[PDB]
Amino acid sequence: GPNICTTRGVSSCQQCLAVSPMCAWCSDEALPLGSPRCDLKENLLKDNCAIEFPVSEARVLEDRPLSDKGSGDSSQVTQVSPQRIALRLRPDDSKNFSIQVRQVEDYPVDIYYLMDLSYSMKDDLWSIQNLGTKLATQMRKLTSNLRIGFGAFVDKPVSPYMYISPPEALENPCYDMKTTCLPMFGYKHVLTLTDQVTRFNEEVKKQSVSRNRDAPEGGFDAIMQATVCDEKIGWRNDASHLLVFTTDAKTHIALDGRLAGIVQPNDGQCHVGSDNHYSASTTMDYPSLGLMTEKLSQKNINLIFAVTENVVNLYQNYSELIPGTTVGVLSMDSSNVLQLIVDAYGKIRSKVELEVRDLPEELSLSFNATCLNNEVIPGLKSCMGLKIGDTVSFSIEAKVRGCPQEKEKSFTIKPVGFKDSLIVQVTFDCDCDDFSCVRYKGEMCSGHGQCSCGDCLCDSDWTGYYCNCTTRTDTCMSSNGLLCSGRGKCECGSCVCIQPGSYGDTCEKCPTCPDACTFKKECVECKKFDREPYMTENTCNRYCRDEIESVKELKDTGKDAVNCTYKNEDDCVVRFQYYEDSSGKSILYVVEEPECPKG
Amino acid sequence: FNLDVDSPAEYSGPEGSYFGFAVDFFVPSASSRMFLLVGAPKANTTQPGIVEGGQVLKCDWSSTRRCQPIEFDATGNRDYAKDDPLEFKSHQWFGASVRSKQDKILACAPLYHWRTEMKQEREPVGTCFLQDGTKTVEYAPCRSQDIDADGQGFCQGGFSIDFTKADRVLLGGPGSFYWQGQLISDQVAEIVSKYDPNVYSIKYNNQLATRTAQAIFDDSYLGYSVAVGDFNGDGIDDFVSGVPRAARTLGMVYIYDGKNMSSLYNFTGEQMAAYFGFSVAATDINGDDYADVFIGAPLFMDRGSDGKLQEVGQVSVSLQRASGDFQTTKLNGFEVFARFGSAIAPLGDLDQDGFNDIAIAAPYGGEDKKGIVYIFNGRSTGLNAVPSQILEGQWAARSMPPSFGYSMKGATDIDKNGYPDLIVGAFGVDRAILYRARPVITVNAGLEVYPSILNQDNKTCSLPGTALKVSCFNVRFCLKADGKGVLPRKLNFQVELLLDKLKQKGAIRRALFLYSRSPSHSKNMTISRGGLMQCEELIAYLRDESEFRDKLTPITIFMEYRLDYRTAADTTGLQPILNQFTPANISRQAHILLDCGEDNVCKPKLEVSVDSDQKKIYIGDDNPLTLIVKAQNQGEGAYEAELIVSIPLQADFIGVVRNNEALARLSCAFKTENQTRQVVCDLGNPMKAGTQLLAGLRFSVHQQSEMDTSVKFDLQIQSSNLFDKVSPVVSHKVDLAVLAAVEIRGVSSPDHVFLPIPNWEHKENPETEEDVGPVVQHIYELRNNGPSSFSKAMLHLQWPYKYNNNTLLYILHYDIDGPMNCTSDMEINPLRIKISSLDIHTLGCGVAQCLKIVCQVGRLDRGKSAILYVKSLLWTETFMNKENQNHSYSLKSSASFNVIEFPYKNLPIEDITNSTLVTTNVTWGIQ
């Protein structure tokens, strides 16, 4: 059959393959032929010659099962299933594969406490003395392994920020306040990560505050340093990491240092030394959020912004820029720093997002995620509301546009935060008119696609006849972590609400939506009765994730909370109160012992 | 769009002095030779005990490339008492900012410290020094009796500066009033006139200055950057200053009035920590004599294809219209971490095209942070967002990033040629570079063939050697040049011609030049004064009828012309270049005589038809439209036959339909050389006779408010045949329709209420919600989904008022979200029940006493809605039991809407109508 391969084969093998992976070529010694030389071996084989016709493939090269417990002797505790796999794609073809990610319980955890020692913390530096052992236990019962460290910062010890040197006798204290405080330091590393969770208490005890003229501190300076200095802080290669950043103040950002007369940008390199004092604070400007991420990410550190309400809103907004970062609300005495690290830990261990380091240029990578048994949500590649010890699955598809130059070209794929990962060494086996294309709005292939003969060959992160449709979902975001507010699907970066009677960029807006209650009923009717469709779908675990805790006789009184009442399959009237606030905690107080017909 | 970069002037400075950190042109009226100023914030001086005080070097322009430091002050630190210094100059960063207005030049030292006549300090108030000829005064507005940080003790005034047309100074000090920041404007004159060596704190007369403000603003950094220009009716430049830390570090840009220093406009960032304001610039980008604002955010994070947040910074480009409001746009960097809007710099008309250009620098982009400057050209429409040029720092680091472009001055033609120039400084490597603009040259080329249609037979004109007659034809390639500035005279173009380019390699070149017998000849030219288009003629014959059998493919003549590197002044060499968007090759074609009657001339018969298939373009959204063109030739061969479709401004060409077996895959393309918006389609160069042809051109119309009844297309076939070359222009309209899917929705929040009713007290003459009943609540939404919007609608909400002189749902009040006004035929809270100060089943209006709430609706576009929020109260008198079973009630309330008016009026409409109902079922479970 004279077709695609026929029309673009005459040339030579090279081009014959360069057409479609559904073609082939054949000829060696001197065997003749009157039929095309480039075909679909099926149309070709019944015409002699029979082995130069490759087929793409992805051979796993390393399995190793998911394990179910952190560090247990020799077994290299793994959290991702395949670790190595070799891809060999031929011209313009593709090849799907998969990946497994387990939240391996009892996995060692590192906790670096990095507090702001501005005078507004002398107190704070008290209701922490106990903490460290107090920590050690709440942690213990959630990890057979725990290491903690400590760090302190203020700001660059320079003219604007620091007390220049007015009285010669002010380079040493809080001279006019009398109190007599320790001089300015920027970033000091106190206690390196150890298991002797007492050294921590025997340390903060010696610690004292300092003072700074300017409101904004030099926290970020520190954050960068207790993250890329590792041999110092002593983070554990195979462990979950935590940088507890706690402050009650605003913060300097990059470019501010200009005033102090500091214009050399942050190189993101470790600059601590023997004295454990960031020895560049004065010569190097504060790091930018971009550098902060790039490094926070690379080193697999989980920054936690423990801050005071007076400045909390500020840091939420800031983390929105440094994704993967959680923010809790500390206190004036940090008294509650304890149950803050925890809720953070868990909150982080509650999700798995797949990231791609060093992917090749002409290589395309589409994903599909499976996180709720069988139910696959085509498009995403991240998941939340998961329980420590649970496993998820992602299906990746690899695809090359054209054919680069041979090379062990190898990129990776791994969960943000995780040490484990699936290295993927690709290899490429590759040995009309560009004019008339389609045009979206002035550009050939919407300026996002190559134009080969018939259609366009979209660039990575683009799809569709024209290549206008993107492969992004971020825009479909929505403060929920649930794309399109669970009210709609995400197609081409923009949500298309399934019209439950809603609208909005992420379908967030839905004024005629049924009573806030009606929604959270299928919730209490499974977690407290097993009944209701939500248990049938075998969910009611990943979805209904509030805190249904049957209340005493009387219900509640907490204002700013709603009440609800419904009749159960049983015909009795259940009374319950919805409630949100605090850490952002939401619980559903349920009157115990409904009202059933007497008799 | 083109600065020399081969050999540019290279200046340098002491190792580590930060030479190049600040730059500017010096152009004294007292002389004819300009110089270039370069601040060296960290230099060392012969100043008594003043280590690293900084300097400002005046560089000469004349092969010598020397820079001798301008002497602003040789004085060490003054005293306040024996041993207790009054000021500290060492490490003051003098030179950190350097502007010049004429024979005068401002130079500040913003890390200059002062101890004050009061207590013993070391406050960084900063200080400038204004030189002018020989007299040198000291400017220091922030050094006054108002000390410390809650005052002006930490301004670092001089952190930014600038002069205004009417000669005045704009000085910024980021530290003022708890780092809120400050702006101070003084008259140059008053500055030198009110000077006095014996008065550390001088009172200048007409001094403009911002005042301290509320604490919320602390740490904003007003004065971090500053630029000037006019932003009202007329007058003098007003003040423009960036405020990095402004907002929640969203950063703002303030534009103050230059006469009274009062606020005029603000600009806010979009992304925290981006450092909006780090830089600003005023200059007119679109030659509309109205100044234009440029704000740079060196740390802006945008997203890549994979949608990941990435740092590349952007530049806000706000265009000022006569109105007073601005029409802004954005421009993001390219390389990550390079810091794009890190330094914006106005040039004049870098190419004298009639519009000003602007340069943006990404200090740490390329090679190894070697630094990059992108120059952007301006144009009527706005500022072209595509770098016309790229300056690459050619200097490696050694201790810190070179920083090419962190600073750069323009808008000054330090030389001959009537074109600007540009200074750029890399203080990491300690140096500055001056790039000299090249003279733009605009050139025109002509190319015509003596006989248009070559006749194989007829062959006058004989060959060269073997005197044998052949069918010749002539070529006339003429050329026109000349541009502005300094360059003329010379101008020589190396041309080149070709026959049968549509053939190139592979022989069969049906045409050759007379005396050459070659398919390609070349030559030179020369000219200068525009208009003196020096021509050059050639003669070409056609091969013998027997050496080729191709007689359809036209024989095109191709001429390409290029300039030579030798038409520059003794400026140590400065070759110009041709206008960016200008072709260095034109081409015309010839056609062998074939099938043209007997008179030997071809005269076609063109016709275009278009049936109104789709015919239905709904106003509002982007409606798709495709038309079936039917071009056909019923005469003789039409040369360069092509379909010409004149499309509407509301329509845009997609492409030719191919998803079909009946249409031709024409090779169309969209263009508009003349504001005519047209798509062109090839129909065959020789376009054979009786060649009917169907094909589909699809696109998308975008209508527009009010406007007229319908959008039309214009179709015609144009050919290059001397006779009957075109066809009757056939037009085709498509009516605009109106479709507005409007809908109404309701929700009775608690779609249920159980009467056992958790406690309750029947209190005669109630005074609060709880004393009444629970809060039932209905919500109605009217929303227009359809594409076309409307301008007026009515809303009728009937409400379940009472059943038998017995109240049902006691309405407490109602709210509205959107363009809507509502009215109740009855007063709502007759019992004035303020908030809490701690026919027997369905009860509708058909069977119950009604309360009508009417609402008049404004204009709802596509994707908008109005919303009624009715907040009632279940009057608990739904209590009875002594009589049968007092139970099960379905409280109903309905709401209907009527669409009465659209803003089109000239188009056919219809009345949109519909309604819906919402119930609140009250019942008994433990009856």
Ligand SMILES: *[C@@H]1O[C@H](CO)[C@@H](O[C@@H]2O[C@H](CO)[C@@H](O)[C@H](O)[C@H]2NC(C)=O)[C@H](O)[C@H]1NC(C)=O
């Ligand atoms: C300017 O001169 C100073 C003074 O000699 C140089 O620095 C001296 O030595 C170290 C740096 O190597 C400084 O910490 C001292 O403060 C300086 N000593 C004295 C007596 O001032 C400095 O390196 C020179 N700067 C430049 C750009 O050349």
Ligand SMILES: *[C@@H]1O[C@H](CO)[C@@H](O[C@@H]2O[C@H](CO)[C@@H](O)[C@H](O)[C@H]2NC(C)=O)[C@H](O)[C@H]1NC(C)=O
């Ligand atoms: C631009 O923004 C600034 C700061 O947000 C506004 O200035 C404040 O205006 C209020 C209202 O009168 C005053 O009470 C404050 O004293 C001002 N603060 C500062 C720092 O100036 C300013 O009014 C805004 N201008 C415009 C046109 O929006």
Ligand SMILES: *[C@@H]1O[C@H](CO)[C@@H](O[C@@H]2O[C@H](CO)[C@@H](O)[C@H](O)[C@H]2NC(C)=O)[C@H](O)[C@H]1NC(C)=O
């Ligand atoms: C309130 O009660 C009425 C009727 O009891 C419900 O309205 C409709 O009732 C008829 C009669 O049985 C049904 O055929 C319809 O299916 C009902 N409509 C709907 C939308 O269900 C009304 O639904 C009841 N409200 C609630 C919340 O159940």
Ligand SMILES: *[C@@H]1O[C@H](CO)[C@@H](O[C@H]2O[C@H](CO)[C@@H](O)[C@H](O)[C@H]2NC(C)=O)[C@H](O)[C@H]1NC(C)=O
């Ligand atoms: C560019 O991609 C968009 C993605 O939606 C396409 O536009 C479509 O818009 C509507 C559906 O979303 C339809 O009414 C349009 O008919 C459809 N566009 C076309 C050409 O059919 C479209 O594929 C691309 N846009 C264009 C102008 O080609």
Ligand SMILES: *[C@@H]1O[C@H](CO)[C@@H](O[C@H]2O[C@H](CO)[C@@H](O)[C@H](O)[C@H]2NC(C)=O)[C@H](O)[C@H]1NC(C)=O
């Ligand atoms: C609904 O829940 C509220 C909780 O807010 C209950 O009322 C309690 O809280 C109110 C808000 O401060 C107080 O005004 C009430 O006095 C308080 N209740 C008591 C007995 O003091 C209320 O019981 C619930 N209402 C219904 C109908 O279930």
Ligand SMILES: *[C@@H]1O[C@H](CO)[C@@H](O[C@H]2O[C@H](CO)[C@@H](O)[C@H](O)[C@H]2NC(C)=O)[C@H](O)[C@H]1NC(C)=O
């Ligand atoms: C009025 O709006 C209704 C929608 O509420 C349109 O009715 C259609 O959808 C209803 C869903 O509740 C059904 O009850 C109707 O039977 C159904 N009818 C049709 C023809 O689709 C109705 O079309 C709208 N009225 C007008 C004139 O458009």
Ligand SMILES: *[C@H]1O[C@H](CO)[C@@H](O[C@@H]2O[C@H](CO)[C@@H](O)[C@H](O)[C@H]2NC(C)=O)[C@H](O)[C@H]1NC(C)=O
């Ligand atoms: C001259 O002919 C064209 C220009 O008319 C050149 O080819 C391209 O032309 C398009 C415009 O249609 C430009 O966008 C491209 O930049 C041009 N190519 C290049 C490499 O610049 C062509 O190069 C020239 N022909 C010859 C023989 O020199």
Ligand SMILES: *[C@@H]1O[C@H](CO)[C@@H](O)[C@H](O)[C@H]1NC(C)=O
């Ligand atoms: C996305 O989901 C599908 C499920 O059918 C899966 O096969 C693959 O990973 C993706 N689809 C395609 C066509 O690649």
Ligand SMILES: *[C@@H]1O[C@H](CO)[C@@H](O)[C@H](O)[C@H]1NC(C)=O
């Ligand atoms: C400056 O003069 C006053 C002072 O505020 C005010 O009218 C305005 O800010 C400026 N001028 C005009 C004409 O408004």
Ligand SMILES: *[C@@H]1O[C@H](CO)[C@@H](O)[C@H](O)[C@H]1NC(C)=O
């Ligand atoms: C041949 O072409 C026409 C005649 O058909 C006429 O121009 C002349 O006779 C010949 N050529 C030239 C260039 O004159």
Ligand SMILES: *[C@H]1O[C@H](CO)[C@@H](O)[C@H](O)[C@H]1NC(C)=O
């Ligand atoms: C960030 O916090 C909330 C998010 O909704 C909101 O107030 C605003 O978007 C931001 N506010 C501040 C102070 O940054």
Ligand SMILES: *[C@H]1O[C@H](CO)[C@@H](O)[C@H](O)[C@H]1NC(C)=O
């Ligand atoms: C209702 O609000 C005011 C009444 O004073 C009026 O300006 C507005 O135009 C009215 N809105 C509509 C939609 O008629």
Ligand SMILES: [Ca+2]
């Ligand atoms: Ca405190």
Ligand SMILES: [Ca+2]
């Ligand atoms: Ca003015």
Ligand SMILES: [Ca+2]
């Ligand atoms: Ca303008």
Ligand SMILES: [Ca+2]
């Ligand atoms: Ca220009």
